[PDB]
């Protein structure tokens, strides 16, 4: 199951959400943490993540599972990296979290850290999963 | 298959030989670097490495692929350790090499460093692979 991948990403307790989304043809969340936000990702959101226009979200922001995010680093489409870092939008004073989206041949690996978790840590975890997927041609 | 593990252990250039050995029931070299020493390990030698008698090799030593070695540290069966450190027996003034063998549930991982490479470097390299295997119930 693609779900076995979510358990892996959630195992060390540093993250609060994770997701594997198929972005080709008919976008869909292949696996996610039940009851959180990533599960609620719509094809529209996947559309802008991989969209060709990589400048409009730097102005209006982004949304994942309906959760507003700010782009901080976009290398999603850049070979060798294929990663994009983000930060949730504080829900009125509330705490923001670090998110990292990595893209492979057929999927989008998403990860959201817990409150106060180094975003570079979230990034590495994410980056290493995508590399595992890319090695198997996924 | 198993041969891909040899590629991983040999990737950085610090070691000159490596081998994955299955020691239960019918001892066998599952993968080794072609034309070297470990590729010639025998079931009898695997017998000594994991045998019950853990004192006799200290007096006469042991061989690996016919190569005489001296045991230094032996925690092969010790839980949490599963490692044994050795050193080839210098053919006169010939150079000695550091060797470490680690044990998993189904395999033995062997590693031989190049001349002058720190034995503690070779030990970690080996130990980390055994751990990957172990965590994969192997």
């Amino acid at each position: 199951g693609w779900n076995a991948y979510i358990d892996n990403l959630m195992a060390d307790g540093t993250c609060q959400d994770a997701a594997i989304v198929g972005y080709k043809d008919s976008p869909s969340v292949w696996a996610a943490v039940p009851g959180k936000t990533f599960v609620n990702i719509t094809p529209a959101e996947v559309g802008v993540l991989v969209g060709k226009d990589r400048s409009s979200f730097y102005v209006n922001g982004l949304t994942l599972g309906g959760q507003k995010c700010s782009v901080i680093r976009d290398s999603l489409l850049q070979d060798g990296e294929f990663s994009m870092d983000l930060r949730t939008k504080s829900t009125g004073g509330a705490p923001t979290f670090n998110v990292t989206v990595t893209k492979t041949d057929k999927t989008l690996v998403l990860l959201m850290g817990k409150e106060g978790v180094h975003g570079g840590l979230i990034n590495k975890k994410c980056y290493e999963m995508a590399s595992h997927l890319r090695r198997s041609q996924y | 298959g198993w041969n891909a593990y040899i590629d991983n252990l040999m990737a950085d250039g610090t070691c000159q030989d490596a081998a994955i050995v299955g020691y239960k029931d019918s001892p066998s070299v599952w993968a080794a670097v072609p034309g070297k020493t470990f590729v010639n390990i025998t079931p009898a030698e695997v017998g000594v490495l994991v045998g019950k008698d853990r004192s006799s090799f200290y007096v006469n030593g042991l061989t690996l692929g016919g190569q005489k070695c001296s045991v230094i540290r032996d925690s092969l069966l010790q839980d949490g350790e599963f490692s044994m450190d050795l050193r080839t027996k210098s053919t006169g003034g010939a150079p000695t090499f550091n060797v470490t063998v680690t044990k998993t549930d189904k395999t033995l991982v062997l590693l031989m460093g190049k001349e002058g490479v720190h034995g503690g470097l070779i030990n970690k390299k080996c130990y980390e692979m055994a751990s990957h295997l172990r965590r994969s119930q192997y």
Binding site: G1, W2, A4, Y5, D7, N8, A11, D12, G22, D25, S26, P27, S28, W30, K106, M129, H132, L133, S136, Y138 | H132, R135, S136
Partner: peptide, 15 residues
């Protein structure tokens, strides 16, 4: 409506 996902390859081992 999306088609069922492809069969995933073996995942990495747990921590």
């Amino acid at each position: 409506p999306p088609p069922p996902p492809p069969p995933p390859p073996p995942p990495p081992p747990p921590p």
